[PDB]
C-alpha cells in the first residue's frame, strides 16, 4: 500500500503524559537533560503551558492538579532552572499511538497527516483555548490557514516567565507574520528592550515563531477535554498536514 | 490548476503575445480553481496609490502561479508545489547567472509602455523576477529613502534621490521614481532604530577596541576609509559570548528587515536566457 | 485635541501611520456597535 | 445649510420574462480529474 | 537528471575504493555549474584554500547544492540530490552525537592540517562540511568570532589561557579543540571582513541612531524616544563631549553613513543565520548512520 | 619604456578525427515512464 507520513518511535517515562495518554494529538517537546541516562525527555504541550504566563490561574491550577507528581515536580524545577527555554526544550511533533507500557511508547509525526495505520480516525491537533489568538487583518481570510507556535517571554522583576501562543493565519510569509506579530507584541517588547541589557542570562530575543503546518478553515471545531472530570475548553484542529520549518526569532 | 477565462474574445495578435508570454509566474489572490479577468495579475491593485512598497506588501501576500498552455481564451495556471522543478520565462532585464536565489518584485515602471496586454481598461501587470542580491539592494534603497525623507530640506530631496536612485547591477540601469514618502519606511526603520540602540547598548568591549587595536597594529587602505567613517579583559568570556550573540541577533533582525523571501532556485539556464529551470516553492 | 473632543472622536486615532498603512489599506479594528435594530446606514454631506 | 445624501438597500424579489429560444448553449462532455493527497483524493468535474 | 554521475580523473587504489565504501553515504556540496569531472568542483576543495575569506566560505557553502553519495560504481560516483520534504539516509561524519528530532546543518570543516585527508589524488583532496546540530553551529560561530576578535589584541598576559578556554567546548560529553590557535594560519580562516564589518556595525550604530532620535518628537512617540535615551545612556553615559566637528553634519553625510551601515549587514548576511539542512527522524544503532528528512 | 599586455578572446572551430570504430557504445532499450497529472500526462523517458 501507500503511507507517505513520517513518524518516529518514542520512549518516555509514563509520569509526564498524564492526560495525553488518553487524547491522541498533542504537541510534544524535546527536553535534553544533563543527566546522562535520560538524555532526551519528552514534554507535553499542556505540561509546559502549566508555567506559561498566558494561562489564567483557574486553568493553570486545574491542569496542575492534572500534573502533580514527584517526577513532574523535578522536571518543572529543571525547566525553571534552565536559563532561557526555547533551545533547552524544543518543538518535536504531534502525538499518535500512546502505548502505555512501563516506559510508554509514543509514535510522533514529523510530516504528513496524523494517523497510526489503516487510515481510520485521522486525529487532529488539540490546542488549549486560552493559549491561541489569530492576529490578522481579516480572521479566517479565504481558505486554509497555516498554524504557527510562538514562544514569548516575560520578566516580572525576579525571573523570566515564558508564554506559549499559537497563531492561525492565512499568511504563509514569515516576514509578514513577524511584522504582524510585532504590532501585536510591541508593549512587552519595549519592556524587554529595557530588560535584555541588564540581564546576564544568555538570551537574545523577545520570542520566536515556528510553523507547525497546514490546517483547513472548515475543520476548526470547538470542544473540551476531560481527565478526572476536569473540563477544559479546547479548540480542535481536525486535519493537519504537519510542516515544520525553522525557528524565526524576533526582538 | 487554476483556469482563467476572460469572457472576452481575443484576437490572433493576442494569442501570439500569450504564446510569447508562456511559462511566466503570475500572482493571484483568489485561490480557486477558476479565475477571470478581474483577479488575474497585478492590475486589480495597481490603481490604488501606485506605492511601490504597498504593491510589495500585497505581492508578499499574493499566491503565485505559472502560466501554461493557453488554449485561446482559456488560460491554465499551474499552482507549483514545494521543491519541484519548474520552467520560468524571465521578464527582469538581467543576465541571470545560474544557481542564485530569486525573489519576486513589483514591476519597476520603465519609460516604454508595456506590450504585454491592454484590453478594455485592463492591463496584464506582471511582477518581475529578480535575484535576491538586487532585491535586498532595492529594499536598502527604500529604507534609505525613508531615512533621508524623514529629514526635511528644500532642494536636497531631489539631490539625494537623483544620485541614489539610478543603480547598476550586472550592466543594467534601473530607477524607482515618485516615492510618496509614506510611513512604511518609518516603521521598518523604527525597529531598525530600536535594534541599533540595542547594538549600542549591548555591543562588547572587545569590538570597538578591535578597530583601534587592528589599526594601531597594521593598516590597509579600506581600513583608512573605515577610519574616515570612524573619525584589562580579565575573564568575562561567557558575558562576551552572550553580548556577541545579542549583537548577532540584532544584525539578524535588521537583515530580516531588508531581506526578501527567495521564491526560486535556478539549476539550468537556456543559452538565450529567456527560460530557466528552478527547484523551489516556499 | 479640542476639535476631536468637541466632535466626539477617540483622541488616539493615529497608530504608527495607520497601523503601518493597513488602515491606509482600510478596514475594521473596532467592535461594531453592540446593539443594532435596523441594519445599515451611511449619510454623506454637502455644504450649501 | 446642507444637502445630506443617503442610500438605502432594499430586499426586492424581481421576476424575468424571456422569449423562447433566445440564446443557445453548447457544452462539453464534463472532464474528470483527480488530485491524490496523502489522506484524501479530491475529484473535480469541470464543464465548459 | 534526478541523479548525477561524476567521473574521476585517475583510477582508484584499493585503499581509495575502501575509503569510498567506508564513506558510501555523505553530503557533498557541488556548485551550480555541472562539472562532470570527479576531481573538479566537488567536496568544495576548489573553494577553500584557493579563495579564502570565511564569509565567502560561509556564503558559498550556503549557496552550493548539497548532494548525497548513494553508490560507487567501478569508476563513477552516483550522487542523488535531495528532494525537499522526503527521507534520505546520512552516515555520520561529525564528532558530535545525533539524537532524534535534531535539526542538522552544514558548517565548514575546522580544517586543521593534521587530518587524514580522506581522498588525496594528486594535489586534489576531499573535505566535507560537518553535519552538526544547530545550537552547536551557533556556538561554534560565536567561538570562532571571539577567537578572531581577541587574536589581533596585544599585551594580554592571559592570552594563551583565554584562547585555550575559547578553543575548549563540550556538548553531550564529546570534546573538541578549536583549531584557531595562536595564528599559525594553517586554516585560521582569518575572518577579517567579518570582524571589521561587525565592528563597523557596533561602530556606526550610536551616532546614526543619535541623528535620528534628535529629530521629530513633537508628537508623543514616548515608546522609542525615552527608551533610546536610556539605551544610549547606559552604555555611553558621558555622551558627546569633544563633539569632533561640533555638530555641522551633511545630509549627504548621514546618507552615506546609513547606506554603509545597511550594506555591511547584508555583507554579514552569511553569518546571520544557519539553515536546517536536515531534520533527523530516527537514529540507527551505534550512531554510525541516521535516516533523516531533507529541508531547505 | 612600457610593455602592454592584452587578453584577446577568439572563437575557434576545431577539426576532429576518429578511427574506424573508435568507441563502442552500449544502448539501453528506452523505458517509457508515464507520469500522470491533472491535465498533462508527461511521458518522460530515458536511455542509459
UniProtKB/Swiss-Prot annotation, chain A:
Keywords carried by this UniProt record: Capsid protein, Host nucleus, Virion
Single GO MF descriptor: DNA binding
GO cellular component terms attached to this protein's record: host cell nucleus; viral capsid
Main location (coarse class): virion
Disulphide linkage map: none
Keyword ATP-binding: no
Role: Structural component of the T=16 icosahedral capsid. The capsid is composed of pentamers and hexamers of major capsid protein/MCP, which are linked together by heterotrimers called triplexes. These triplexes are formed by a single molecule of triplex protein 1/TRX1 and two copies of triplex protein 2/TRX2. Additionally, TRX1 is required for efficient transport of TRX2 to the nucleus, which is the site of capsid assembly.
Binding partners and assembly: Interacts with TRX2, MCP and capsid vertex component 2/CVC2.
Family membership: Belongs to the herpesviridae TRX1 protein family.
Record-given protein name: Triplex capsid protein 1
Residues of the full protein shown: 49 to 299 of 299
UniProtKB/Swiss-Prot annotation, chain B:
One Gene Ontology CC term in the entry: viral capsid
Coiled coil: none
Keyword Protein transport found: no
Signal peptide: none
A Pfam family matched in the record: Herpes_V23
Keyword set includes Ribonucleoprotein: no
Localization in the cell: Virion; Host nucleus
Family: Belongs to the herpesviridae TRX2 protein family.
Function recorded in the entry: Structural component of the T=16 icosahedral capsid. The capsid is composed of pentamers and hexamers of major capsid protein/MCP, which are linked together by heterotrimers called triplexes. These triplexes are formed by a single molecule of triplex protein 1/TRX1 and two copies of triplex protein 2/TRX2. Additionally, TRX1 is required for efficient transport of TRX2 to the nucleus, which is the site of capsid assembly.
Subunit structure: Interacts with TRX1 and major capisd protein/MCP.
Record protein name field: Triplex capsid protein 2
Gene giving rise to this polypeptide: TRX2
Swiss-Prot record, chain C:
Organism whose genome encodes this protein: Human herpesvirus 6B (strain Z29) (HHV-6 variant B)
Record's protein name: Major capsid protein
Family: Belongs to the herpesviridae major capsid protein family.
Residues of the full protein shown: 1106 to 1153 of 1345
Description of how the protein assembles with itself and partners: Homomultimer. Makes the hexons and eleven out of twelve pentons. Interacts with triplex proteins 1/TRX1 and 2/TRX2; adjacent capsomers are linked together in groups of three by triplexes, heterotrimeric complexes composed of one molecule of TRX1 and two molecules of TRX2. Interacts with scaffold protein; this interaction allows efficient MCP transport to the host nucleus. Interacts with capsid vertex component 2/CVC2. Interacts with the small capsomere-interacting protein/SCP.
Cellular location(s): Virion; Host nucleus
Purpose of the protein: Self-assembles to form an icosahedral capsid with a T=16 symmetry, about 200 nm in diameter, and consisting of 150 hexons and 12 pentons (total of 162 capsomers). Hexons form the edges and faces of the capsid and are each composed of six MCP molecules. In contrast, one penton is found at each of the 12 vertices. Eleven of the pentons are MCP pentamers, while the last vertex is occupied by the portal complex.
Curated annotation (Swiss-Prot), chains D, F:
Source species, domain of life: Viruses
Subcellular location: Virion; Host nucleus
Subunit structure, interactors included: Homomultimer. Makes the hexons and eleven out of twelve pentons. Interacts with triplex proteins 1/TRX1 and 2/TRX2; adjacent capsomers are linked together in groups of three by triplexes, heterotrimeric complexes composed of one molecule of TRX1 and two molecules of TRX2. Interacts with scaffold protein; this interaction allows efficient MCP transport to the host nucleus. Interacts with capsid vertex component 2/CVC2. Interacts with the small capsomere-interacting protein/SCP.
Family from the record: Belongs to the herpesviridae major capsid protein family.
Function, as annotated: Self-assembles to form an icosahedral capsid with a T=16 symmetry, about 200 nm in diameter, and consisting of 150 hexons and 12 pentons (total of 162 capsomers). Hexons form the edges and faces of the capsid and are each composed of six MCP molecules. In contrast, one penton is found at each of the 12 vertices. Eleven of the pentons are MCP pentamers, while the last vertex is occupied by the portal complex.
Protein's UniProt name: Major capsid protein
Gene giving rise to this polypeptide: MCP
Amino acid at each position: 500500500r501507500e503511507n507517505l507520513r513520517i513518524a518516529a518511535r518514542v520512549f518516555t517515562p509514563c509520569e509526564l503524559l498524564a492526560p495525553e495518554l488518553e487524547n491522541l494529538g498533542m504537541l510534544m517537546y524535546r527536553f535534553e537533560t544533563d543527566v546522562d541516562n535520560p538524555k532526551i525527555l519528552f514534554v507535553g504541550l499542556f505540561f509546559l503551558c502549566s508555567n506559561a504566563f498566558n494561562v489564567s490561574a483557574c486553568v493553570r491550577t486545574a491542569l496542575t492538579t492534572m500534573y502533580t507528581n514527584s517526577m513532574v515536580d523535578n522536571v518543572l524545577s529543571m525547566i525553571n532552572t534552565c536559563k532561557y527555554l526555547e533551545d533547552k526544550v524544543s518543538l518535536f511533533g504531534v502525538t499518535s499511538l500512546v502505548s502505555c507500557g512501563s516506559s510508554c511508547l509514543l509514535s510522533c509525526v514529523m510530516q504528513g497527516n496524523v494517523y497510526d495505520a489503516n487510515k481510520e480516525n485521522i486525529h487532529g491537533l488539540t490546542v488549549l483555548k486560552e493559549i491561541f489568538l489569530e492576529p490578522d487583518w481579516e480572521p479566517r481570510q479565504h481558505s486554509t490557514q497555516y498554524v504557527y507556535v510562538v514562544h514569548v517571554y516575560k520578566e516580572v522583576l525576579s525571573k523570566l516567565q515564558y508564554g506559549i501562543y499559537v497563531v492561525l493565519t492565512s499568511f504563509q510569509n514569515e516576514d509578514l507574520v513577524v511584522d504582524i506579530l510585532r504590532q501585536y507584541f510591541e508593549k512587552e517588547r519595549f519592556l524587554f528592550l529595557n530588560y535584555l541589557i541588564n540581564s546576564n542570562t544568555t538570551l537574545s530575543y523577545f520570542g520566536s515563531v515556528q510553523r507547525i503546518g497546514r490546517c483547513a478553515t472548515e475543520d476548526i471545531k470547538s470542544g473540551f477535554l476531560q481527565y478526572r472530570g476536569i473540563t477544559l475548553p479546547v479548540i480542535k484542529l481536525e486535519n493537519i498536514f504537519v510542516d515544520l520549518s525553522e525557528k524565526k526569532v524576533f526582538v | 490548476t487554476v483556469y482563467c477565462t476572460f469572457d472576452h474574445k481575443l484576437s490572433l495578435s493576442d494569442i501570439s503575445t500569450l504564446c510569447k508570454l508562456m511559462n511566466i509566474v503570475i500572482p493571484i489572490p483568489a485561490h480557486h480553481h477558476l479565475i477571470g479577468s478581474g483577479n488575474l495579475g497585478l492590475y486589480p491593485i495597481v490603481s490604488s496609490n501606485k506605492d511601490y512598497v504597498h504593491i510589495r506588501n500585497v505581492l508578499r501576500t499574493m499566491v503565485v502561479t505559472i502560466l501554461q498552455k493557453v488554449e485561446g481564451n482559456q488560460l491554465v495556471l499551474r499552482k507549483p508545489m514545494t521543491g519541484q522543478q519548474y520552467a520560468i520565462k524571465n521578464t527582469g532585464p538581467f543576465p541571470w547567472e545560474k544557481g542564485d536565489t530569486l525573489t519576486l518584485i513589483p514591476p519597476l515602471s520603465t519609460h516604454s509602455e508595456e506590450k504585454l496586454l491592454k484590453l478594455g481598461d485592463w492591463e496584464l501587470t506582471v511582477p518581475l523576477v529578480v535575484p535576491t542580491a538586487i532585491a535586498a539592494e532595492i529594499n536598502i534603497r527604500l529604507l534609505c529613502i525613508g531615512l533621508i525623507a524623514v529629514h526635511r530640506e528644500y532642494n536636497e530631496m531631489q539631490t539625494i534621490i537623483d544620485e541614489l536612485c539610478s543603480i547598476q547591477y550586472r550592466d543594467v540601469l534601473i530607477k524607482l521614481p515618485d516615492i510618496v514618502n509614506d510611513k512604511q519606511s518609518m516603521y521598518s526603520m523604527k525597529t531598525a532604530c530600536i535594534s541599533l540602540s540595542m547594538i549600542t547598548a549591548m555591543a562588547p568591549d572587545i569590538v570597538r577596541t578591535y578597530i583601534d587595536r587592528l589599526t594601531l597594529e597594521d593598516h590597509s587602505m579600506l581600513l583608512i576609509k573605515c577610519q574616515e567613517l570612524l573619525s584589562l579583559h580579565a575573564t568575562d568570556i561567557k558575558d562576551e559570548l552572550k553580548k556577541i550573540k545579542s549583537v548577532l541577533t540584532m544584525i539578524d533582525q535588521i537583515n530580516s528587515l531588508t531581506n526578501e523571501k527567495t521564491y526560486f532556485v535556478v539549476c539550468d539556464v537556456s543559452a538565450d536566457n529567456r527560460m530557466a529551470t528552478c527547484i523551489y516553492k516556499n | 485635541t479640542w476639535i476631536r473632543h468637541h466632535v466626539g472622536i477617540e483622541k488616539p486615532n493615529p497608530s504608527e501611520g495607520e497601523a503601518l498603512n493597513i488602515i491606509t489599506f482600510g478596514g475594521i479594528n473596532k467592535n461594531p456597535p453592540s446593539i443594532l435594530l435596523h441594519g445599515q446606514q451611511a449619510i454623506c454631506e454637502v455644504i450649501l | 445649510a446642507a444637502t445630506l445624501v443617503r442610500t438605502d438597500n432594499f430586499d426586492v424579489e424581481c421576476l424575468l420574462y424571456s422569449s423562447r429560444a433566445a440564446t443557445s448553449i453548447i457544452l462539453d462532455d464534463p472532464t474528470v480529474t483527480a488530485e491524490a493527497k496523502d489522506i484524501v483524493t479530491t475529484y473535480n468535474f469541470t464543464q465548459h
